[PDB]
C-alpha cells in the first residue's frame, strides 16, 4: 500500500524555526505534485504549500508566503517544509499529501496522506531571567579573598549582560558563558572576588540586563 510519513514536529517558540520532512513507501514522488496541509485546533484543514514536478513552481498560502519554503528531493523521495518566523496560529497537525489519481492528469485530488506530525508554537517568544544571590561564605579567611556573585537562571533567548555596582566594580569579575538547560532555557552565573574585609561596608549589587525581553534586575547580595 502507498504510505507517507512526516518527521520533525515538536514545540517551537514564537518567532523560531522548525523544519519538517516527509518520506514515502511503495511509490516514487518524482511524477507527483507534493503538498503540505495542516489541521488547526478548530478542526478545519488549511492548504499550506505545493511544489510541482521538477520543482517548476512553488505555491504558498497567503498566511505563510515569505515565511515557509517547500523543497523536493526526487532521487531519494523526500519532501521538506521550512517554517520560519513561526506564529501561534501555525500550531496544527501537518500532513504531507500527494496529488494524484488512478491515471495522472493535469489536476488530480489528494489521494494519499501521511498520518501527520504535531507542531506547537508557544506564544512567548522571550522570557526574563530569575536572579538569585550567590552569598559569600561565612567561613571566609580573615584578611581578604572572598567570593560572591549572582545566578541568572531560566531566560530565553541569549544574551544577558551583567555589570556590578553599575560598572564601578570591574577587577576580578568573571561572567561565564551561558549553558543550555534541559528545559530549553539558558542559565549563567557571574562572580567577583573582593577583600573579605569589605563585607559589610561595600554594597554589592549585580545589574542583569536582558535586552530580548527588555528586563533589567538589580539584586543585592549579602552574607548569610
Amino acid at each position: 500500500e502507498v504510505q507517507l510519513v512526516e518527521s520533525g514536529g515538536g514545540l517551537v517558540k514564537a518567532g523560531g524555526s522548525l523544519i519538517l520532512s516527509c518520506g514515502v513507501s511503495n511509490f516514487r514522488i518524482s511524477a507527483h505534485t507534493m503538498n503540505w496541509v495542516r489541521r488547526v485546533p478548530g478542526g478545519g484543514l488549511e492548504w499550506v504549500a505545493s511544489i510541482s514536478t521538477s520543482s517548476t513552481y512553488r505555491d504558498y498560502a497567503d498566511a505563510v508566503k515569505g515565511r515557509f519554503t517547500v523543497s523536493r528531493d526526487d532521487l531519494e523521495d523526500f519532501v521538506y517544509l521550512q517554517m520560519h518566523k513561526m506564529r501561534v496560529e501555525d500550531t496544527a497537525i501537518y500532513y504531507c499529501a500527494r496529488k494524484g489519481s488512478d491515471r495522472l492528469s493535469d489536476n488530480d485530488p489528494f489521494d494519499a496522506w501521511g498520518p501527520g506530525t504535531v507542531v506547537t508554537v508557544s506564544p512567548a517568544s522571550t522570557k526574563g531571567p530569575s536572579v538569585f544571590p550567590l552569598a559569600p561564605s561565612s567561613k571566609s579567611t580573615s584578611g581578604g579573598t572572598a567570593a560572591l556573585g549572582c545566578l541568572v537562571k531560566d531566560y530565553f533567548p541569549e544574551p544577558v549582560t551583567v555589570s556590578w555596582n553599575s560598572g564601578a566594580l570591574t577587577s576580578g569579575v568573571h561572567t561565564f558563558p551561558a549553558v543550555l538547560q534541559s528545559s530549553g532555557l539558558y542559565s549563567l552565573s557571574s562572580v567577583v572576588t573582593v577583600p573579605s574585609s569589605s563585607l559589610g561596608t561595600q554594597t554589592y549589587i549585580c545589574n542583569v540586563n536582558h535586552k530580548p525581553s527588555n528586563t533589567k534586575v538589580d539584586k543585592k547580595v549579602e552574607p548569610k
Partner: protein
C-alpha cells in the same frame, strides 16, 4: 482567491439516515471539486473527485453532485463508520483550498454536563506546580465553554482542554480542562472556580473551592 463555504458546520443524525452536505464556491470552479473523510487523529481519506467520481473502493452509499458554485455530498444510509468530519476541496493544477469542515455526529437527546472541580494534590504542590482540573461529564451536543476564574478574575492562556470521542454506550462527550499555575501564583489567591456553559443548562453552572479547605 476562491473561497469555499460548507454547510452545516455540525450535522446530527441517526444511523440509517440519508444526509446531505452542501459546499459553495465564491466563483465557478466547473467540476473541480473533491470530498474527503477524516476521523480524529487520522489521515484524511479521498472519497470523491471531479465532483461526482467515486474513488475505487469507496462504498456506493457515497455520492456527489453539483457544478459551478453549488456542490453536494450525499451519504445514503449512514453507518457508524461514517460518523467523522467531511471536507470539500477545490483543487487546481498547482494549488488548492478547503472548506471549513462539517462534523457528522450521532444525534441524541440534550444532556447537561455533570461538573466537578479538583484542587491540586499536596504532593504536586510540593514540587512547585499547581494543576487545577475541571471535568465536564457526559454531555451532548459537543459544544461547551469552560472559563476559569481565580478570585473572580477571568484567566486566559494558562489552561488546556481535551475532549473524548462520542461514548460508545450513551453517545455523550466528556471534557477535561487543566489550569496550570506555579506554586507562587497559586498561593497568592484564595477562590478558584470553573464556570461552565452548555446547551443542556438553562444558566451557567460554576464549581469552586477555597485554597486549603
Amino acid at each position: 482567491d476562491v473561497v469555499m463555504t460548507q454547510s452545516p458546520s455540525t450535522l446530527s443524525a441517526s444511523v440509517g439516515d440519508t444526509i446531505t452536505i452542501t459546499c459553495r464556491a465564491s466563483q465557478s470552479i466547473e467540476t473541480w471539486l473533491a470530498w474527503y473523510q477524516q476521523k480524529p487523529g487520522k489521515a484524511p481519506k479521498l472519497l470523491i473527485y471531479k465532483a461526482s467520481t467515486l474513488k475505487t473502493g469507496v462504498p456506493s452509499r457515497f455520492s456527489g453532485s453539483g457544478s459551478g458554485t453549488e456542490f453536494t455530498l450525499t451519504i445514503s444510509g449512514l453507518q457508524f463508520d461514517d460518523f467523522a468530519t467531511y471536507h470539500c476541496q477545490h483543487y487546481a493544477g498547482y494549488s488548492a483550498t478547503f472548506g471549513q469542515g462539517t462534523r457528522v455526529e450521532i444525534k441524541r437527546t440534550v444532556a447537561a454536563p455533570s461538573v466537578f472541580i479538583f484542587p491540586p494534590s499536596d504532593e504536586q504542590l510540593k514540587s512547585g506546580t499547581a494543576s487545577v482540573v475541571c471535568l465536564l461529564n457526559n454531555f451532548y451536543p459537543r459544544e461547551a465553554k469552560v472559563q476559569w476564574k481565580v478570585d473572580n478574575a477571568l484567566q486566559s492562556g494558562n489552561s488546556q482542554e481535551s475532549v473524548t470521542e462520542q461514548d460508545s454506550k450513551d453517545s455523550t462527550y466528556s471534557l477535561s480542562s487543566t489550569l496550570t499555575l506555579s506554586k507562587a501564583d497559586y498561593e497568592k489567591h484564595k477562590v478558584y472556580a470553573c464556570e461552565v456553559t452548555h446547551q443542556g443548562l438553562s444558566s451557567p453552572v460554576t464549581k469552586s473551592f477555597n485554597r486549603g479547605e
